[PDB]
Amino acid sequence: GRPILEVPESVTGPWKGDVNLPCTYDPLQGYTQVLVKWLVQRGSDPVTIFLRDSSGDHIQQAKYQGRLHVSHKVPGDVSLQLSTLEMDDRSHYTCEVTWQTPDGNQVVRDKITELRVQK
Amino acid sequence: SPMYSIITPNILRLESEETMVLEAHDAQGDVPVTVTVHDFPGKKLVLSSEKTVLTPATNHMGNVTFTIPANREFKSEKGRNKFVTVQATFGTQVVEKVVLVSLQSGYLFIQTDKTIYTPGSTVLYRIFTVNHKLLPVGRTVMVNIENPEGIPVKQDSLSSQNQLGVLPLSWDIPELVNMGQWKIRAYYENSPQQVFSTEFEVKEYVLPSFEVIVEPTEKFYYIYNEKGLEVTITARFLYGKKVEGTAFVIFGIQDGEQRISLPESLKRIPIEDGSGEVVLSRKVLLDGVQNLRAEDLVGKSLYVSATVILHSGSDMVQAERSGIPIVTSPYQIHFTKTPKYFKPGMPFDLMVFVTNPDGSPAYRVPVAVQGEDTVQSLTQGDGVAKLSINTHPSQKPLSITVRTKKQELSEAEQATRTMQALPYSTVGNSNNYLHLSVLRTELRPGETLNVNFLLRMDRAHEAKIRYYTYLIMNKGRLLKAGRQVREPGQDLVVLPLSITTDFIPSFRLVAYYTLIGASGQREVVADSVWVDVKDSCVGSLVVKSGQSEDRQPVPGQQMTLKIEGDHGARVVLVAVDKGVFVLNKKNKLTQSKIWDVVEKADIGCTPGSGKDYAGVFSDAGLTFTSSSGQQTAQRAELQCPQ
Amino acid sequence: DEDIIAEENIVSRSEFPESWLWNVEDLKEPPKNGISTKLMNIFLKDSITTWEILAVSMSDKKGICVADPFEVTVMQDFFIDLRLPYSVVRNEQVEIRAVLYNYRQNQELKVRVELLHNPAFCSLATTKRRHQQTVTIPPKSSLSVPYVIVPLKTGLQEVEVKAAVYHHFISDGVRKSLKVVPEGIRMNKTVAVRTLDPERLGREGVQKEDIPPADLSDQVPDTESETRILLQGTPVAQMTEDAVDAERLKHLIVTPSGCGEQNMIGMTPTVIAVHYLDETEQWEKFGLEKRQGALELIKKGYTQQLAFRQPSSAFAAFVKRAPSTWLTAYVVKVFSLAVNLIAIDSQVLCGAVKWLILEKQKPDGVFQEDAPVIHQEMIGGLRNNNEKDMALTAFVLISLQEAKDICEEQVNSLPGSITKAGDFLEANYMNLQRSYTVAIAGYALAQMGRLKGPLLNKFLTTAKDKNRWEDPGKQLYNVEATSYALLALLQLKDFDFVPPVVRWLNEQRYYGGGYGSTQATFMVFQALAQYQKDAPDHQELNLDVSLQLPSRSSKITHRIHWESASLLRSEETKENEGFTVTAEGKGQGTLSVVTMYHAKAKDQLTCNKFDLKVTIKPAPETKNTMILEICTRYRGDQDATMSILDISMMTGFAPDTDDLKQLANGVDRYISKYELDKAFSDRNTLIIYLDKVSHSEDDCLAFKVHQYFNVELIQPGAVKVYAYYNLEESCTRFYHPEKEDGKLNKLCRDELCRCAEENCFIQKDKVTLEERLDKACEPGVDYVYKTRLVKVQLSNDFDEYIMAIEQTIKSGSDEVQVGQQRTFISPIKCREALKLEEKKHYLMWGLSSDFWGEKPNLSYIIGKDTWVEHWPEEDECQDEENQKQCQDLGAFTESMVVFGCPN
Ligand SMILES: *[C@H]1O[C@H](CO)[C@@H](O[C@@H]2O[C@H](CO)[C@@H](O[C@@H]3O[C@H](CO)[C@@H](O[C@@H]4O[C@H](CO)[C@@H](O)[C@H](O)[C@@H]4O)[C@H](O)[C@@H]3O)[C@H](O)[C@H]2NC(C)=O)[C@H](O)[C@H]1NC(C)=O
Numbered sequence A: 001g002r003p004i005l006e007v008p009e010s011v012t013g014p015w016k017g018d019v020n021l022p023c024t025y026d027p028l029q030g031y032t033q034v035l036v037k038w039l040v041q042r043g044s045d046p047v048t049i050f051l052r053d054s055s056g057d058h059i060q061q062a063k064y065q066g067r068l069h070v071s072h073k074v075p076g077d078v079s080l081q082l083s084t085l086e087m088d089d090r091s092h093y094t095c096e097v098t099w100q101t102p103d104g105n106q107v108v109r110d111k112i113t114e115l116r117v118q119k
Numbered sequence B: 001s002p003m004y005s006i007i008t009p010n011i012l013r014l015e016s017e018e019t020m021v022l023e024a025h026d027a028q029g030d031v032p033v034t035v036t037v038h039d040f041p042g043k044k045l046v047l048s049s050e051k052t053v054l055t056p057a058t059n060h061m062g063n064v065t066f067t068i069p070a071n072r073e074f075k076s077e078k079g080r081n082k083f084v085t086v087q088a089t090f091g092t093q094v095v096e097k098v099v100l101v102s103l104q105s106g107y108l109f110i111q112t113d114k115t116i117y118t119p120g121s122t123v124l125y126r127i128f129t130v131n132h133k134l135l136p137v138g139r140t141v142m143v144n145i146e147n148p149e150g151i152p153v154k155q156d157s158l159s160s161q162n163q164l165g166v167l168p169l170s171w172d173i174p175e176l177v178n179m180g181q182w183k184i185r186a187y188y189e190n191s192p193q194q195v196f197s198t199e200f201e202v203k204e205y206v207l208p209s210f211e212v213i214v215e216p217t218e219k220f221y222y223i224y225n226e227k228g229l230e231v232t233i234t235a236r237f238l239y240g241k242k243v244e245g246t247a248f249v250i251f252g253i254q255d256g257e258q259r260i261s262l263p264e265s266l267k268r269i270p271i272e273d274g275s276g277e278v279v280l281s282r283k284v285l286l287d288g289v290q291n292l293r294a295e296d297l298v299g300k301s302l303y304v305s306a307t308v309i310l311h312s313g314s315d316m317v318q319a320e321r322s323g324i325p326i327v328t329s330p331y332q333i334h335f336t337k338t339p340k341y342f343k344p345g346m347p348f349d350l351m352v353f354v355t356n357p358d359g360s361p362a363y364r365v366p367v368a369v370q371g372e373d374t375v376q377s378l379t380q381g382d383g384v385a386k387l388s389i390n391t392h393p394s395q396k397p398l399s400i401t402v403r404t405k406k407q408e409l410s411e412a413e414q415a416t417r418t419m420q421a422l423p424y425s426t427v428g429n430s431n432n433y434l435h436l437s438v439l440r441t442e443l444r445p446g447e448t449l450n451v452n453f454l455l456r457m458d459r460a461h462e463a464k465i466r467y468y469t470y471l472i473m474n475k476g477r478l479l480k481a482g483r484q485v486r487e488p489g490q491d492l493v494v495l496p497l498s499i500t501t502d503f504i505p506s507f508r509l510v511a512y513y514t515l516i517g518a519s520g521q522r523e524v525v526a527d528s529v530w531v532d533v534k535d536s537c538v539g540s541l542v543v544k545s546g547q548s549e550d551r552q553p554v555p556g557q558q559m560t561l562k563i564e565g566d567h568g569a570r571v572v573l574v575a576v577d578k579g580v581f582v583l584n585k586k587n588k589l590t591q592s593k594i595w596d597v598v599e600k601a602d603i604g605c606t607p608g609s610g611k612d613y614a615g616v617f618s619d620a621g622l623t624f625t626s627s628s629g630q631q632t633a634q635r636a637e638l639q640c641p642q
Numbered sequence C: 001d002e003d004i005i006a007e008e009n010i011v012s013r014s015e016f017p018e019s020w021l022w023n024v025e026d027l028k029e030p031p032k033n034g035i036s037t038k039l040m041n042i043f044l045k046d047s048i049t050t051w052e053i054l055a056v057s058m059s060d061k062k063g064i065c066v067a068d069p070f071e072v073t074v075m076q077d078f079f080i081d082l083r084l085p086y087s088v089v090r091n092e093q094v095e096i097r098a099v100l101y102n103y104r105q106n107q108e109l110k111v112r113v114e115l116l117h118n119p120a121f122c123s124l125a126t127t128k129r130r131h132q133q134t135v136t137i138p139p140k141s142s143l144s145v146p147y148v149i150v151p152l153k154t155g156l157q158e159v160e161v162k163a164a165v166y167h168h169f170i171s172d173g174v175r176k177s178l179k180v181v182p183e184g185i186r187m188n189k190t191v192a193v194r195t196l197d198p199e200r201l202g203r204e205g206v207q208k209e210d211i212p213p214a215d216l217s218d219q220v221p222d223t224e225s226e227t228r229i230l231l232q233g234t235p236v237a238q239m240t241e242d243a244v245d246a247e248r249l250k251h252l253i254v255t256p257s258g259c260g261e262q263n264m265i266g267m268t269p270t271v272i273a274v275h276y277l278d279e280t281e282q283w284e285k286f287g288l289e290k291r292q293g294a295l296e297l298i299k300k301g302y303t304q305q306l307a308f309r310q311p312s313s314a315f316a317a318f319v320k321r322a323p324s325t326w327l328t329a330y331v332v333k334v335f336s337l338a339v340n341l342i343a344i345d346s347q348v349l350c351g352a353v354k355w356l357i358l359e360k361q362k363p364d365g366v367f368q369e370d371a372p373v374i375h376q377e378m379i380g381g382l383r384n385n386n387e388k389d390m391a392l393t394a395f396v397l398i399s400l401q402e403a404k405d406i407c408e409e410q411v412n413s414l415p416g417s418i419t420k421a422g423d424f425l426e427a428n429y430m431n432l433q434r435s436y437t438v439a440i441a442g443y444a445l446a447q448m449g450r451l452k453g454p455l456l457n458k459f460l461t462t463a464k465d466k467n468r469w470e471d472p473g474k475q476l477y478n479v480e481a482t483s484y485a486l487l488a489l490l491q492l493k494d495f496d497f498v499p500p501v502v503r504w505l506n507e508q509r510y511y512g513g514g515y516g517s518t519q520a521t522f523m524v525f526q527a528l529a530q531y532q533k534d535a536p537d538h539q540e541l542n543l544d545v546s547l548q549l550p551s552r553s554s555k556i557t558h559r560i561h562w563e564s565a566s567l568l569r570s571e572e573t574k575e576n577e578g579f580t581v582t583a584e585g586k587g588q589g590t591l592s593v594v595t596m597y598h599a600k601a602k603d604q605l606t607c608n609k610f611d612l613k614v615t616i617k618p619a620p621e622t623k624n625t626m627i628l629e630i631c632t633r634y635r636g637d638q639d640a641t642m643s644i645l646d647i648s649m650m651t652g653f654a655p656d657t658d659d660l661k662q663l664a665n666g667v668d669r670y671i672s673k674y675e676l677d678k679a680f681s682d683r684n685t686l687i688i689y690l691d692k693v694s695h696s697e698d699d700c701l702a703f704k705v706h707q708y709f710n711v712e713l714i715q716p717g718a719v720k721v722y723a724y725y726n727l728e729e730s731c732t733r734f735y736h737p738e739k740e741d742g743k744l745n746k747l748c749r750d751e752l753c754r755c756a757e758e759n760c761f762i763q764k765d766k767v768t769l770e771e772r773l774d775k776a777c778e779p780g781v782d783y784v785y786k787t788r789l790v791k792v793q794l795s796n797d798f799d800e801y802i803m804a805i806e807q808t809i810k811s812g813s814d815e816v817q818v819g820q821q822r823t824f825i826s827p828i829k830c831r832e833a834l835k836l837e838e839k840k841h842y843l844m845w846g847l848s849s850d851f852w853g854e855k856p857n858l859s860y861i862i863g864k865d866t867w868v869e870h871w872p873e874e875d876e877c878q879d880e881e882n883q884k885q886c887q888d889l890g891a892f893t894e895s896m897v898v899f900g901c902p903n
């Protein structure tokens, strides 16, 4: 049928260490991926923090630059690796993946995940 | 008789296409139609225009679309609610109706270049002009600049004609002035009571060199928590790298507008590597509310002010998080989304909306009708779960009570709420209904959507139901209307409604069939349903560092910006030193703060159904009418009533 | 110095927008995927920070749309962060922080920070001696360098500091700017609050206005004095009294039923209701669909009345009966108003009138009643027997003057039957004792443009208590005749005498209907209708305020209109002057006058909520260490909460390690584990945190400051308290040994000041002839005098040396005559070094930039650039000890006299 994202609800990871905010799927026959957004949700509105298109990765808030290497070698994986973790990283993160089908049109699945930071 | 129908919006705007659906039920032959719209009393015809021919190769359905022109004599009687007639001529037959008229050309939006300005600086501001379809359009706009006390020190009236509805302006703020919150008010020359604003602080300042961000672990305080409010300071130099410093935090309880300090809370923590933990305990809190009867803090918010200072002494900066809801449950349930009228014997689906204590959505959170364990349903991305129940064929007001059913939270921690729904008053106790159901998913454009058309009635007359006619509401006007067919033996049919940009942010569904029965009584059973859509730009827009992905630039350096957007659009840019926000981060521009207007500015008022068939249509912003006499009642009031 | 970059080869980071990149770019390139791309290339501003970028796009089909923020961060491994405030007051010593950062991941940095010299500021940097320190910033760190200065130049002034690093190539430099402001204090002194109102004692000769200069003789000189003007326009609108509610007139919808006279009885209250409900717009509340069910109930009456239309186009009870003079007109009346409402026939409405004029009139013009009707009670006030000839002439005539709009060239003698019938009224109006004939003929005369003088007086005065037109008896011929009085007052256009007549009828809230309601019902709703059409919408403003200052060239024609949704304006004068404000016709307007300025200070100034004292003294028993003492506390004696003491240290001074730890564990006080573990390498800034500080006592503390970097001069330090809950509520005291009370050496007279931290005069050995002859032909050598010192007025602050010019060797910018005296000032700290004495002669160089005050009273200043030299007296020249100098000094002169610097 169509794709759905295996993203867990709550992920915990330690202070000033790494973690894998998983976001995955299972590729279908023709469904060619064209946009992977990670949207951190600080306020009551969401914002773009990662982006992937025809020209690679593109981080859009400096408070991440160089902490956020999304996982690339595996098909059906868009996990958010994330190093030197801070306290102000506590938030609800989104994973949003866009596919093109053959029939020159498009579809988009997104799921949400809370990042909690332990001590 | 062949019934001739005539649906149009409850309120018709100025300088606006408002469509109007013509139907000739059970009819024979090509039937011409003139359409007419006189002003109200003292009939000068502001739109004779538009005519058509309702052939049998659509089953006698068509429409006509007109613009009410904001004329000179629609600028004569100012401040009382204007009016039009709509003379729907069906050849020899005429079917007119009276419709209310809001002026309301379209929306306006106002970009500041910042949020706070120092005396002697020029405020750069941009006014975007759009008709309620949010398209750009050319008009004339009175633009005021009002001072602290509410007094205007500059006016203008400009034309956005030939400017891509993007009206740039500037205002040199004088070197001497009243400080405080300034305003920029604007209105279309034709809607000077619909005034869009935007504020911006005038204040003396230099800019800081770092920010603070106070935030508790939890977006609320629970009162039986022995730990107390746990809080985290975090402070960072605007240029990315962390701080070593020393921080003064303190708490207090907000209560309406009255704010009470908690002097004994004032702790002085050092800041290591950006972060700095801190706690307002329980006992220290409760002892500062000598009202002393623990519960009394229910609904009273908390607030933290921090004051971080660096170890050099060079700079400091204050920061406060106002509104920590002191609560007995980390959830909150709202039937804002759920209709208030069921269908006896049929189901009644409950769009349960569910929130964390700061009026935001809560995701994957189980809900249950009380009296119904086992049955439960999870809240999806937006904060809506759908419940649904079989009602008994009697006309007894419903009395539903929905709880949160989280494991982890003791029953007294679960939030609950309860409501009352009423029976759709059938036409002369005939027990004939129509029920529209829609599955419960975050709707994106490009996807396609199933609308179940459920028919509940006595079988002696159900064979004479050859179609449900239906209509779509988005942004205040009719988007589309067609026919979803049904042949007998059935009860349910299903409309695969294609969902495009045109529906954002939300859309309603109003549908109805027509039947003659009992003996010679024209019957019209209808239903509605409001659907939320994924709020997003209609088009798209990004800015990125197109110049080789990554690297990290230096004072002076020339880089490059891919701007990626819509062909044949105009983009207007601004850059701002994050500093400015450390001061004021309010009244910036947000797509969603638009869609707020768009869906503050609805004409529709009910999440579905009505008290009867008339209710259905006029709650949902429509004006059904016919040559038989069955019609909605007058819409007196312009605003939705609350 | 060695291995570095010199100051001349360092460019400043200057650009410090708060907002920028304001811009329009159109995505004209062609769509790929349906998604267009423009590559903006862009220069970056020198601000080291993070830039948030926000785009918004506006598209033909795809409406508005807003993008997301996109952060771009601009960074350096090394840089300065110059911490200038917003403003700083003139000739008040201030402190500023210059913060340096070293972010090289594992690299110590030896640095040279320098302030650059600006004559807008007193500061240790002088043009021939830079202000510069050399310090070692550690890795991953910052380091505060203070700079203590004095703002001399009022206005907008500049501050530039720089740094280079050793054994590398890294450099950086900041050039912020801060606001310098008047010594005294901000004041708003009003000069006039006048009311612009032509006519109300603006007078027949329109309002003319003189407005005097401000007070201004306690003004702090060399400061601005803006004279402001505030023109407002104050309106008040409407005298429209409330409409009679809709929920009340429901019974007036009377279905017309019966004969010729029981149809118009029942036609009126439905007909009149429409014409009232059209022009109040009320249909809203009453009901909206209930109109179309009342149109046909007018047309029904109309066509049921078309049957009785007698052969001769007249009107009575039956067709058998003779025609009533009254019912013809009253039909002309009821139809004429309903010309709009439906299709009335042209032959009919201008047919009933042609019957009246040709048959029913006298020579003088009376419209007599040949047929006394059977239902008289309908006719209202006409039921009485007296003056029937007058009031019936007016009733039939009134209808003619409402049916003159349409019918103009059907009935030819209409400019005729109204002319005679008016003179009858106008002549015989003043014999009426009753209100009715005074209130109804008055309306008839009010429609001819003929009611003035004694006729109008009687009209306006027959109204008892200035509102109602009454009579003795049945109280329906008074709610009737008062609404002939309203309709005259609305064709008088007299909105003075109108509002009451209405207000009385809205207290008599008469909702028609019933027996004999007819007229009462008709004219009351035809009058309280016309009121709501014509009555002032918005009371009018059209002020053309003229201002004309002598200062400026041209007038200033401030147009004013209600419709201008501000009705607020301003004019900014720079120079205080006397200026005329004329004003012309209508409305009413505000005219404020204010001047901002500054005045002298009072002697209880501004360390408002913090008294602070600070001292420094030498060592204990046994290089040079001193006792820094801080005794402070807080006004409004309620023990202030938590606070900062911020200590800046003296150029190369350092607190002792031991002393500090005494104070840290001393309770009700705190110093952080960071500032202790810090190096002796750099402890030039230090914050003492405090828990409490009232002014019950003074919280006294002190500690020992080990000097480790020996140098001449040295900068003072500064302690500065504030409570954490306001960096405004603060107080900044200084300290330093030689000068005391930390203050820098400056020389101020009245207003402005001279940066006096430099050479007293050209310094020191051989003093050969060339060596002298040369140095007085440099750039700014404006004068050369041989002087006798004639008096030596020492003082504390500044010295005085009255020198008498014995001869001008080189004159210049100051035409001083020989024998004349000139005063020379010099700082007190130069006294012993100059060491002069009266009766003695000197040699004096000096520049033009050294004078003090305007001609003819030009004081000279001795500084760094003057040459002052002992000149031996005549007889004392012959001495084997003063031999050489005496010969050279009197060789020096001959060169300058005969030749003059041979440039
Ligand atoms: C009454 O007036 C209405 C306006 O309210 C008129 O509406 C007409 O409606 C249709 C459909 O909405 C519109 O477009 C045509 O329909 C085709 C559907 O097969 C469109 O093809 C494709 O649709 C896809 C759906 O997702 C889309 O992805 C794809 O891009 C493409 O659009 C195609 O666009 C057709 O042109 C008509 O244009 C529109 N009329 C007008 C004036 O534009 C309608 O005439 C009246 N209603 C009735 C039924 O009488």
Ligand SMILES: *[C@@H]1O[C@H](CO)[C@@H](O)[C@H](O)[C@H]1NC(C)=O
Pocket: B177, B178, B179, C186, C187, C188, C594
């Ligand atoms: C008076 O001075 C204050 C500033 O000290 C200023 O804000 C205000 O605008 C002035 N008031 C008048 C009369 O204009």
Ligand SMILES: [Ca+2]
Pocket: B505, B506, B532, B533, B534, B535
């Ligand atoms: Ca939505």
